[PDB]
Amino acid sequence: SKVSVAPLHLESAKEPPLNTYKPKEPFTATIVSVESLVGPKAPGETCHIVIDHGGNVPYWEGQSYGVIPPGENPKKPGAPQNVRLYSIASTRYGDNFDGRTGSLCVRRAVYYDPETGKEDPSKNGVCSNFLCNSKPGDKIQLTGPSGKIMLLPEEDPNATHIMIATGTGVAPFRGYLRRMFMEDVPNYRFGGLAWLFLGVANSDSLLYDEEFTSYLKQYPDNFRYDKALSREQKNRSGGKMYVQDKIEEYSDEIFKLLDGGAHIYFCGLKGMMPGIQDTLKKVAERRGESWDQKLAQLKKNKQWHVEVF
Ligand SMILES: Cc1cc2nc3c(=O)[nH]c(=O)nc-3n(C[C@H](O)[C@H](O)[C@H](O)COP(=O)(O)OP(=O)(O)OC[C@H]3O[C@@H](n4cnc5c(N)ncnc54)[C@H](O)[C@@H]3O)c2cc1C
Ligand SMILES: [Mg+2]
């Protein structure tokens, strides 16, 4: 049932790779495919991009690639564009199970005049649209990989991993979960609990939903999956249903799991964290506990993993 992956020597490295390529001399990779992940009612396009790096830019799950879009620095004429980082959405073996490709999950950044709604492409995001406009065979300047915060702790193969995502923040967790449930990795047999919370605008904006629902069916005792559809569901107080409200619904069992040593991960909108904090704070305090002190402990114990942007 698990998918054969190759080559097994990608397991050999003792330490994550870091900054194998830097902006001064990037790696010229090649697009394999680009597809929309969303339906017509989504507020914007998010695309899945598969990139052939030829085995020249390996990474571990949870890392990022940098992309240098073409053109010159608009601020610094006679200079290349700055790097944009993207969370890698694939396992180290990639979507072709062969160790040659990695994938990105990219939301197009588009500008709309606040009053008239007139879109203005001159104010669109350069790199996000460059990527989702890409076609098979196009060349892309890759840097990295980078990142350590979102590496998956594998010391306990029966650990609990609580994953909190908004939008493209799902990307690392797609990689985690394929490694946990889909790929045949003899040196990592996951037997714990993986719990994905995902916040997106509506049903049409769901990302990789089919893949996650399949894990629910295959591994009902090791995978849980909750969704906050902000524009189709209301929280208990009449506002938009956000991931922190879903967390609140399970506040007692999330705290027990954290108390038990669970890892908790946050990726996506930086603006979600104050509400998640608020929500975790209330639970700690009703128990008689300082959240300030508890959060400090969770970080000291290396249980708290944040990459928001
Ligand atoms: C660690 C990390 C991981 C990340 N992972 C992901 C990911 O998985 N997926 C993802 O989609 N993004 C991710 N990002 C964000 C990503 O790096 C980019 O910042 C994002 O794609 C936008 O870059 P851009 O080049 O498209 O926009 P930019 O060209 O950098 O422009 C930024 C914004 O300014 C707006 N803008 C430009 N000109 C004007 C103007 N005149 N008036 C008004 N507005 C203007 C653009 O519309 C855009 O929204 C991540 C960021 C970090 C730090
Ligand atoms: Mg869909």
Question: Does CATH place domain 147-308 in 3.40.50.80?
Answer: yes
Ligand 1 binding pocket includes 106 (Cβ within 6 Å):
yes
- Measured in angstroms, the resolution is 1.8
Q: Which of 210, 167, 227, 216 is nearest to 193 (CA)?
A: 216
Torsion of CA 285, 288, 293, 295, to 10 degrees: -40
CA pair distance 13, 41, nearest whole angstrom: 43
Ligand 1 binding pocket includes 168 (Cβ within 6 Å):
yes
Ligand 1 binding pocket includes 307 (Cβ within 6 Å):
yes
> Residue holding tokens 């037997």?
191
Annotated binding site for FAD: 84-87, 105, 107, 123, 126-128
CA pair distance 19, 146, nearest whole angstrom: 6
| Ligand 1, atom 32, residue with closest C-alpha | 125
Cα(109) to centroid(ligand 1), Å: 6
CA pair distance 175, 102, nearest whole angstrom: 10
Buried b (16+ CB within 10 A) or exposed e, 181-206: bbbebeeeebebbbbbbbbbbbeebb
Cα(221) to centroid(ligand 1), Å: 38
CATH entry, 8-146, from 2.40.30.10, 2.40.50.100, 2.170.190.11, 2.102.10.10? 2.40.30.10
CA atoms within 13 A on the CB side of 233: 17
Annotated binding site for NADP(+): 87, 107, 168, 230-231, 240, 268-269, 307
Which whole-number Å values give the CA distances from 196 to 84, 172, 218, 226, 273, in the listed order?
Answer: 26, 11, 15, 6, 16
* Interstrand relation of 139-146 and 183-184 (parallel, antiparallel or unpaired): unpaired
What angle in degrees, to the nearest 10, is found between the helix axes of 273-286 and 291-300? 110
CA pair distance 233, 265, nearest whole angstrom: 24
CA pair distance 84, 296, nearest whole angstrom: 31
Ligand of minimum distance to the alpha carbon of 208 = 2
Cα(170) to centroid(ligand 1), Å: 17
Structural domain boundaries in the chain: 8-146, 147-308
Q: Which residues contact 271 (CB under 8 A, 6 or more apart)?
A: none
CA pair distance 74, 71, nearest whole angstrom: 8
Cα(128) to centroid(ligand 1), Å: 7
Cα(207) to centroid(ligand 2), Å: 7
Is 8-146's fold the same as 147-308's? no
Torsion of CA 57, 60, 61, 64, to 10 degrees: -50
Q: Which of 67, 52, 58 is nearest to 17 (CA)?
A: 58
Cα(37) to centroid(ligand 2), Å: 7
CA pair distance 161, 57, nearest whole angstrom: 27
Ligand 1 binding pocket includes 85 (Cβ within 6 Å):
yes
CA pair distance 145, 175, nearest whole angstrom: 15
Ligand 1 binding pocket includes 90 (Cβ within 6 Å):
no
Q: Which of 56, 90, 87, 84 is nearest to 70 (CA)?
A: 84
Ligand of minimum distance to the alpha carbon of 308 = 1
CA pair distance 89, 74, nearest whole angstrom: 29
How would you class 89 by CB atoms within 10 Å of its CB: exposed for 0-12, middle for 13-18, buried for 19 or more?
A: buried
> Residue holding tokens 């899945």?
48
Give the DSSP per-residue string, the chain: -PEE-S-GGGGT-SS----SB-TTS-EEEEEEEEEE-S-TTSSS-EEEEEEE-TTSS---TT-EEEEE-SSB-SSSTTSBPPPEEEEB-S-TTTTTTSSSEEEEEEEPP--B-TTT--B-GGGS-HHHHHHHT--TT-EEEEEEEE-STTPPP-S-TT-EEEEEEEGGGGHHHHHHHIIIIIEE-TT----SEEEEEEEESSGGG-SSHHHHHHHHHH-TTTEEEEEEETTT-B-TTSSB--HHHHHHHTHHHHHHHHHTT-EEEEEE-GGGHHHHHHHHHHHHHHTT--HHHHHHHHHHTT-EEEEE-
- By the 8 A CB rule, do 62 and 154 touch? no
> Residue holding tokens 């980078």?
146
Ligand 1 binding pocket includes 105 (Cβ within 6 Å):
yes
Instruction: Return the number of other C-beta atoms located less than 10 Å from residue 211's C-beta.
Output: 13
Q: Which tokens in the block code for residue 168?
A: 């493209």
φ, ψ for residue 216, nearest 5 deg = -55, -40
- Asked, as a colleague might, if the bond just before 69 is cis with ω within 30 of 0, I would say no
Q: Which residue type, as a one-letter code, is found at position 162?
A: I
CA pair distance 134, 117, nearest whole angstrom: 26
Ligand 1 binding pocket includes 123 (Cβ within 6 Å):
yes
Q: Which residues contact 106 (CB under 8 A, 6 or more apart)?
A: 46, 47, 49, 86, 128, 131, 132, 168
Q: Which residues contact 238 (CB under 8 A, 6 or more apart)?
A: none
CA pair distance 88, 267, nearest whole angstrom: 12
Ligand 1 binding pocket includes 171 (Cβ within 6 Å):
yes
